[PDB]
CSV table of N, CA, C and O in Angstrom, one decimal:
chain,number,residue,atom,x,y,z
A,12,UNK,N,0.8,-1.2,0.0
A,12,UNK,CA,0.0,0.0,0.0
A,12,UNK,C,0.9,1.2,0.0
A,12,UNK,O,2.1,1.1,0.3
A,13,UNK,N,0.3,2.4,-0.4
A,13,UNK,CA,1.0,3.7,-0.5
A,13,UNK,C,1.1,4.4,0.8
A,13,UNK,O,0.9,3.9,1.9
A,14,UNK,N,1.5,5.7,0.7
A,14,UNK,CA,1.7,6.6,1.8
A,14,UNK,C,0.4,6.9,2.6
A,14,UNK,O,-0.6,6.9,2.0
A,15,UNK,N,0.5,7.4,3.9
A,15,UNK,CA,-0.8,7.9,4.5
A,15,UNK,C,-1.3,9.0,3.7
A,15,UNK,O,-0.5,9.7,3.1
A,16,UNK,N,-2.6,9.2,3.7
A,16,UNK,CA,-3.3,10.2,3.0
A,16,UNK,C,-2.9,11.6,3.4
A,16,UNK,O,-2.4,11.8,4.6
A,17,UNK,N,-3.1,12.7,2.6
A,17,UNK,CA,-2.8,14.0,3.0
A,17,UNK,C,-3.7,14.5,4.2
A,17,UNK,O,-4.8,14.0,4.3
A,18,UNK,N,-3.2,15.5,5.0
A,18,UNK,CA,-4.0,16.0,6.1
A,18,UNK,C,-5.2,16.6,5.4
A,18,UNK,O,-5.1,17.2,4.3
A,19,UNK,N,-6.4,16.5,6.1
A,19,UNK,CA,-7.6,17.0,5.6
A,19,UNK,C,-7.7,18.5,5.4
A,19,UNK,O,-6.9,19.3,6.0
A,20,UNK,N,-8.6,19.0,4.5
A,20,UNK,CA,-8.7,20.5,4.3
A,20,UNK,C,-9.2,21.1,5.6
A,20,UNK,O,-9.9,20.5,6.4
A,21,UNK,N,-8.9,22.4,5.8
A,21,UNK,CA,-9.4,23.1,7.0
A,21,UNK,C,-10.9,23.1,7.0
A,21,UNK,O,-11.5,23.1,5.9
A,22,UNK,N,-11.5,23.2,8.1
A,22,UNK,CA,-13.0,23.4,8.2
A,22,UNK,C,-13.5,24.8,7.8
A,22,UNK,O,-12.6,25.7,7.6
A,23,UNK,N,-14.8,24.9,7.6
A,23,UNK,CA,-15.3,26.3,7.3
A,23,UNK,C,-15.2,27.3,8.4
A,23,UNK,O,-15.1,26.9,9.6
A,24,UNK,N,-15.3,28.5,8.1
A,24,UNK,CA,-15.3,29.6,9.1
A,24,UNK,C,-16.6,29.5,10.0
A,24,UNK,O,-17.6,29.1,9.5
A,25,UNK,N,-16.4,29.8,11.3
A,25,UNK,CA,-17.5,29.8,12.3
A,25,UNK,C,-18.6,30.7,12.0
A,25,UNK,O,-18.5,31.6,11.1
A,26,UNK,N,-19.7,30.6,12.7
A,26,UNK,CA,-20.8,31.4,12.5
A,26,UNK,C,-20.7,32.8,13.2
A,26,UNK,O,-19.9,32.8,14.1
A,27,UNK,N,-21.4,33.8,12.8
A,27,UNK,CA,-21.2,35.0,13.6
A,27,UNK,C,-21.7,34.9,15.0
A,27,UNK,O,-22.6,34.0,15.3
A,28,UNK,N,-21.2,35.6,15.9
A,28,UNK,CA,-21.6,35.6,17.3
A,28,UNK,C,-23.0,36.1,17.5
A,28,UNK,O,-23.5,36.7,16.6
A,29,UNK,N,-23.6,35.9,18.7
A,29,UNK,CA,-24.9,36.5,18.9
A,29,UNK,C,-24.9,38.0,19.0
A,29,UNK,O,-23.9,38.6,19.4
A,30,UNK,N,-26.0,38.7,18.7
A,30,UNK,CA,-26.1,40.1,18.8
A,30,UNK,C,-26.0,40.5,20.3
A,30,UNK,O,-26.4,39.7,21.1
A,31,UNK,N,-25.3,41.6,20.5
A,31,UNK,CA,-25.1,42.1,21.9
A,31,UNK,C,-26.4,42.5,22.6
A,31,UNK,O,-27.4,42.7,22.0
A,32,UNK,N,-26.2,42.5,23.9
A,32,UNK,CA,-27.3,42.9,24.9
A,32,UNK,C,-27.8,44.4,24.6
A,32,UNK,O,-27.0,45.2,24.2
A,33,UNK,N,-29.0,44.7,24.9
A,33,UNK,CA,-29.4,46.1,24.7
A,33,UNK,C,-28.7,47.0,25.7
A,33,UNK,O,-28.3,46.6,26.8
A,34,UNK,N,-28.5,48.3,25.4
A,34,UNK,CA,-28.0,49.2,26.3
A,34,UNK,C,-28.9,49.5,27.5
A,34,UNK,O,-30.1,49.2,27.3
A,35,UNK,N,-28.5,50.0,28.6
A,35,UNK,CA,-29.4,50.3,29.8
A,35,UNK,C,-30.3,51.4,29.4
A,35,UNK,O,-30.0,52.4,28.7
A,36,UNK,N,-31.6,51.4,30.0
A,36,UNK,CA,-32.4,52.6,29.8
A,36,UNK,C,-31.8,53.8,30.5
A,36,UNK,O,-31.1,53.6,31.5
A,37,UNK,N,-32.1,55.0,30.0
A,37,UNK,CA,-31.7,56.2,30.7
A,37,UNK,C,-32.5,56.4,32.0
A,37,UNK,O,-33.6,55.9,32.1
A,38,UNK,N,-31.9,57.0,33.0
A,38,UNK,CA,-32.6,57.3,34.3
A,38,UNK,C,-33.6,58.5,34.1
A,38,UNK,O,-33.4,59.3,33.2
A,39,UNK,N,-34.7,58.5,34.9
A,39,UNK,CA,-35.6,59.7,34.7
A,39,UNK,C,-34.9,61.0,35.0
A,39,UNK,O,-33.9,61.1,35.7
A,40,UNK,N,-35.4,62.1,34.3
A,40,UNK,CA,-34.8,63.4,34.4
A,40,UNK,C,-35.0,64.0,35.8
A,40,UNK,O,-35.8,63.5,36.6
A,41,UNK,N,-34.2,65.0,36.1
A,41,UNK,CA,-34.2,65.7,37.4
A,41,UNK,C,-35.5,66.5,37.5
A,41,UNK,O,-36.0,67.0,36.4
A,42,UNK,N,-36.2,66.6,38.6
A,42,UNK,CA,-37.5,67.3,38.7
A,42,UNK,C,-37.4,68.8,38.6
A,42,UNK,O,-36.3,69.4,38.7
B,24,UNK,N,4.2,1.0,-2.4
B,24,UNK,CA,3.6,0.5,-3.7
B,24,UNK,C,2.1,0.4,-3.5
B,24,UNK,O,1.6,-0.2,-2.5
B,25,UNK,N,1.4,0.9,-4.5
B,25,UNK,CA,0.0,1.0,-4.5
B,25,UNK,C,-0.5,2.4,-4.1
B,25,UNK,O,0.3,3.3,-3.8
B,26,UNK,N,-1.9,2.5,-4.2
B,26,UNK,CA,-2.4,3.9,-3.9
B,26,UNK,C,-2.1,4.5,-2.5
B,26,UNK,O,-2.1,3.7,-1.5
B,27,UNK,N,-2.0,5.8,-2.5
B,27,UNK,CA,-1.9,6.5,-1.3
B,27,UNK,C,-3.2,6.5,-0.6
B,27,UNK,O,-4.2,6.3,-1.2
B,28,UNK,N,-3.3,6.8,0.7
B,28,UNK,CA,-4.5,6.9,1.5
B,28,UNK,C,-5.3,8.1,1.1
B,28,UNK,O,-4.8,9.1,0.5
B,29,UNK,N,-6.6,8.0,1.4
B,29,UNK,CA,-7.5,9.1,1.1
B,29,UNK,C,-7.1,10.4,1.9
B,29,UNK,O,-6.7,10.2,3.1
B,30,UNK,N,-7.4,11.6,1.5
B,30,UNK,CA,-7.2,12.8,2.3
B,30,UNK,C,-8.1,12.6,3.6
B,30,UNK,O,-9.1,12.0,3.6
B,31,UNK,N,-7.6,13.2,4.7
B,31,UNK,CA,-8.4,13.3,5.9
B,31,UNK,C,-9.7,14.0,5.6
B,31,UNK,O,-9.8,14.8,4.6
B,32,UNK,N,-10.7,13.8,6.4
B,32,UNK,CA,-12.0,14.5,6.2
B,32,UNK,C,-11.8,16.0,6.5
B,32,UNK,O,-10.8,16.4,7.1
B,33,UNK,N,-12.6,16.9,5.9
B,33,UNK,CA,-12.5,18.3,6.1
B,33,UNK,C,-12.7,18.6,7.6
B,33,UNK,O,-13.4,17.8,8.4
B,34,UNK,N,-11.9,19.6,8.1
B,34,UNK,CA,-12.0,20.0,9.5
B,34,UNK,C,-13.4,20.4,10.0
B,34,UNK,O,-14.3,20.6,9.2
B,35,UNK,N,-13.5,20.5,11.3
B,35,UNK,CA,-14.8,21.0,11.8
B,35,UNK,C,-15.0,22.5,11.6
B,35,UNK,O,-14.0,23.2,11.4
B,36,UNK,N,-16.2,23.0,11.5
B,36,UNK,CA,-16.5,24.5,11.4
B,36,UNK,C,-15.8,25.1,12.6
B,36,UNK,O,-15.8,24.5,13.7
B,37,UNK,N,-15.3,26.4,12.4
B,37,UNK,CA,-14.7,27.1,13.5
B,37,UNK,C,-15.7,27.4,14.6
B,37,UNK,O,-16.9,27.4,14.4
B,38,UNK,N,-15.2,27.8,15.8
B,38,UNK,CA,-16.2,28.2,16.9
B,38,UNK,C,-17.0,29.4,16.5
B,38,UNK,O,-16.6,30.3,15.7
B,39,UNK,N,-18.2,29.5,17.1
B,39,UNK,CA,-19.1,30.7,16.9
B,39,UNK,C,-18.3,31.9,17.3
B,39,UNK,O,-17.5,31.9,18.3
B,40,UNK,N,-18.6,33.1,16.7
B,40,UNK,CA,-17.9,34.3,17.0
B,40,UNK,C,-18.2,34.9,18.4
B,40,UNK,O,-19.1,34.4,19.0
B,41,UNK,N,-17.5,35.9,18.8
B,41,UNK,CA,-17.7,36.5,20.1
B,41,UNK,C,-19.0,37.2,20.2
B,41,UNK,O,-19.5,37.7,19.2
B,42,UNK,N,-19.7,37.3,21.4
B,42,UNK,CA,-21.0,38.1,21.4
B,42,UNK,C,-20.7,39.5,21.0
B,42,UNK,O,-19.7,40.1,21.2
B,43,UNK,N,-21.7,40.1,20.3
B,43,UNK,CA,-21.7,41.5,19.8
B,43,UNK,C,-21.6,42.4,21.0
B,43,UNK,O,-21.9,42.0,22.2
B,44,UNK,N,-21.1,43.7,20.8
B,44,UNK,CA,-21.0,44.6,22.0
B,44,UNK,C,-22.4,45.1,22.4
B,44,UNK,O,-23.3,45.1,21.6
B,45,UNK,N,-22.6,45.4,23.7
B,45,UNK,CA,-23.8,46.0,24.2
B,45,UNK,C,-24.1,47.3,23.4
B,45,UNK,O,-23.2,48.0,23.0
B,46,UNK,N,-25.4,47.6,23.3
B,46,UNK,CA,-25.7,48.9,22.7
B,46,UNK,C,-25.4,50.0,23.6
B,46,UNK,O,-25.2,49.8,24.8
B,47,UNK,N,-25.4,51.3,23.2
B,47,UNK,CA,-25.1,52.4,24.1
B,47,UNK,C,-26.2,52.6,25.2
B,47,UNK,O,-27.4,52.5,24.8
B,48,UNK,N,-25.8,52.9,26.4
B,48,UNK,CA,-26.8,53.2,27.4
B,48,UNK,C,-27.5,54.5,27.0
B,48,UNK,O,-26.9,55.4,26.5
B,49,UNK,N,-28.8,54.5,27.2
B,49,UNK,CA,-29.7,55.6,26.9
B,49,UNK,C,-29.3,56.8,27.6
B,49,UNK,O,-28.9,56.8,28.8
B,50,UNK,N,-29.5,58.0,27.0
B,50,UNK,CA,-29.3,59.3,27.8
B,50,UNK,C,-30.3,59.4,28.9
B,50,UNK,O,-31.5,58.9,28.8
B,51,UNK,N,-30.0,60.1,30.0
B,51,UNK,CA,-30.9,60.4,31.1
B,51,UNK,C,-32.0,61.4,30.6
B,51,UNK,O,-31.8,62.0,29.6
B,52,UNK,N,-33.1,61.3,31.2
B,52,UNK,CA,-34.2,62.2,30.9
B,52,UNK,C,-34.0,63.6,31.0
B,52,UNK,O,-33.1,64.1,31.7
B,53,UNK,N,-34.7,64.4,30.3
B,53,UNK,CA,-34.6,65.9,30.3
B,53,UNK,C,-35.1,66.4,31.6
B,53,UNK,O,-36.0,65.9,32.2
B,54,UNK,N,-34.5,67.6,32.1
B,54,UNK,CA,-35.0,68.2,33.3
B,54,UNK,C,-36.4,68.6,33.2
B,54,UNK,O,-37.0,68.9,32.2
B,55,UNK,N,-37.1,68.6,34.4
B,55,UNK,CA,-38.5,68.9,34.5
B,55,UNK,C,-38.7,70.4,34.6
B,55,UNK,O,-39.4,71.0,33.8
C,28,UNK,N,-9.4,-2.0,-6.5
C,28,UNK,CA,-8.4,-0.9,-6.4
C,28,UNK,C,-7.6,-1.2,-5.2
C,28,UNK,O,-7.9,-0.8,-4.1
C,29,UNK,N,-6.5,-1.9,-5.4
C,29,UNK,CA,-5.5,-2.5,-4.5
C,29,UNK,C,-5.3,-1.8,-3.2
C,29,UNK,O,-5.6,-0.6,-3.1
C,30,UNK,N,-4.8,-2.5,-2.2
C,30,UNK,CA,-4.7,-1.8,-0.8
C,30,UNK,C,-4.1,-0.4,-0.9
C,30,UNK,O,-3.1,-0.1,-1.4
C,31,UNK,N,-4.9,0.5,-0.3
C,31,UNK,CA,-4.5,1.9,-0.2
C,31,UNK,C,-3.8,2.1,1.1
C,31,UNK,O,-4.2,1.4,2.1
C,32,UNK,N,-3.0,3.2,1.2
C,32,UNK,CA,-2.4,3.6,2.5
C,32,UNK,C,-3.5,4.1,3.5
C,32,UNK,O,-4.7,4.2,3.1
C,33,UNK,N,-3.1,4.3,4.8
C,33,UNK,CA,-4.1,4.8,5.7
C,33,UNK,C,-4.7,6.2,5.3
C,33,UNK,O,-4.0,6.9,4.7
C,34,UNK,N,-5.9,6.5,5.6
C,34,UNK,CA,-6.6,7.7,5.4
C,34,UNK,C,-5.8,8.8,6.2
C,34,UNK,O,-5.3,8.4,7.3
C,35,UNK,N,-5.7,10.0,5.7
C,35,UNK,CA,-5.0,11.1,6.4
C,35,UNK,C,-5.6,11.6,7.6
C,35,UNK,O,-6.8,11.3,7.9
C,36,UNK,N,-4.9,12.4,8.4
C,36,UNK,CA,-5.6,13.0,9.6
C,36,UNK,C,-6.6,14.0,9.3
C,36,UNK,O,-6.5,14.8,8.3
C,37,UNK,N,-7.7,14.1,10.1
C,37,UNK,CA,-8.8,15.0,9.9
C,37,UNK,C,-8.2,16.4,9.9
C,37,UNK,O,-7.2,16.7,10.5
C,38,UNK,N,-8.9,17.3,9.1
C,38,UNK,CA,-8.4,18.7,9.0
C,38,UNK,C,-8.5,19.5,10.2
C,38,UNK,O,-9.3,19.1,11.1
C,39,UNK,N,-7.8,20.6,10.3
C,39,UNK,CA,-7.9,21.5,11.5
C,39,UNK,C,-9.2,22.2,11.5
C,39,UNK,O,-9.9,22.3,10.4
C,40,UNK,N,-9.7,22.8,12.6
C,40,UNK,CA,-10.9,23.5,12.6
C,40,UNK,C,-10.8,24.8,11.8
C,40,UNK,O,-9.8,25.3,11.7
C,41,UNK,N,-12.0,25.3,11.3
C,41,UNK,CA,-12.0,26.5,10.6
C,41,UNK,C,-11.8,27.7,11.5
C,41,UNK,O,-11.7,27.6,12.7
C,42,UNK,N,-11.7,28.9,10.9
C,42,UNK,CA,-11.5,30.1,11.8
C,42,UNK,C,-12.7,30.5,12.6
C,42,UNK,O,-13.8,30.1,12.3
C,43,UNK,N,-12.5,31.3,13.7
C,43,UNK,CA,-13.6,31.7,14.5
C,43,UNK,C,-14.5,32.6,13.6
C,43,UNK,O,-14.1,33.2,12.7
C,44,UNK,N,-15.8,32.5,14.0
C,44,UNK,CA,-16.8,33.4,13.3
C,44,UNK,C,-16.6,34.8,13.7
C,44,UNK,O,-15.8,35.2,14.6
C,45,UNK,N,-17.3,35.7,13.0
C,45,UNK,CA,-17.2,37.2,13.2
C,45,UNK,C,-17.8,37.5,14.6
C,45,UNK,O,-18.8,36.8,15.0
C,46,UNK,N,-17.4,38.6,15.3
C,46,UNK,CA,-18.1,39.0,16.5
C,46,UNK,C,-19.6,39.4,16.1
C,46,UNK,O,-19.8,39.8,14.9
C,47,UNK,N,-20.5,39.2,17.0
C,47,UNK,CA,-21.9,39.5,16.7
C,47,UNK,C,-22.2,41.0,16.5
C,47,UNK,O,-21.3,41.9,16.7
C,48,UNK,N,-23.4,41.3,16.0
C,48,UNK,CA,-23.8,42.6,15.7
C,48,UNK,C,-24.0,43.4,17.0
C,48,UNK,O,-24.2,42.9,18.0
C,49,UNK,N,-23.8,44.8,16.9
C,49,UNK,CA,-23.9,45.6,18.2
C,49,UNK,C,-25.4,45.5,18.7
C,49,UNK,O,-26.3,45.4,17.9
C,50,UNK,N,-25.5,45.6,20.0
C,50,UNK,CA,-26.8,45.5,20.7
C,50,UNK,C,-27.6,46.8,20.4
C,50,UNK,O,-27.1,47.8,19.9
C,51,UNK,N,-28.9,46.7,20.8
C,51,UNK,CA,-29.8,47.9,20.5
C,51,UNK,C,-29.5,49.0,21.6
C,51,UNK,O,-29.3,48.7,22.7
C,52,UNK,N,-29.5,50.3,21.1
C,52,UNK,CA,-29.4,51.4,22.1
C,52,UNK,C,-30.5,51.3,23.2
C,52,UNK,O,-31.6,50.9,22.9
C,53,UNK,N,-30.1,51.7,24.4
C,53,UNK,CA,-31.0,51.7,25.5
C,53,UNK,C,-31.9,52.9,25.3
C,53,UNK,O,-31.5,53.9,24.7
C,54,UNK,N,-33.2,52.9,25.7
C,54,UNK,CA,-34.0,54.1,25.5
C,54,UNK,C,-33.6,55.3,26.4
C,54,UNK,O,-33.1,55.1,27.5
C,55,UNK,N,-34.0,56.5,26.0
C,55,UNK,CA,-33.8,57.7,26.8
C,55,UNK,C,-34.7,57.6,28.0
C,55,UNK,O,-35.9,57.1,27.9
C,56,UNK,N,-34.3,58.1,29.1
C,56,UNK,CA,-35.1,58.1,30.4
C,56,UNK,C,-36.3,59.0,30.2
C,56,UNK,O,-36.2,59.9,29.4
C,57,UNK,N,-37.3,58.9,31.0
C,57,UNK,CA,-38.5,59.8,31.0
C,57,UNK,C,-38.1,61.2,31.5
C,57,UNK,O,-37.2,61.4,32.3
C,58,UNK,N,-38.8,62.2,31.0
C,58,UNK,CA,-38.6,63.6,31.4
C,58,UNK,C,-38.9,63.8,32.9
C,58,UNK,O,-39.8,63.1,33.4
C,59,UNK,N,-38.2,64.7,33.6
C,59,UNK,CA,-38.3,64.9,35.0
C,59,UNK,C,-39.6,65.7,35.4
C,59,UNK,O,-40.4,65.9,34.5
C-alpha cells in the first residue's frame, strides 16, 4: 500500500456571534 | 507500492464568533 | 483498487466566526 493520505482540508469559518445585549435605559430626568 | 491513502476528512467548522457589543446606554431624561 | 495507504488526519478546525452585531441602544429616560 501507499503513503498515509494528506491532512484534511481546514474546516469552514465559524458562524457570527450572537447580537449584543441592549444598552441600559436612561434614568428619569431631574424634577 | 499501491495507492496513497484518502485525504483526511475536512476539519470542523470554526467556533461561533464572540458576542456582539452591548448597545449604548440611553441618555438620562430631560430636566422637569 | 489495490490496498490503499491509511486515510490522512482530519483537517484542522476553521477560523472563529465574526463578532456579533452591536446591541440595541437603551431608550432615553423619561422627562423629570
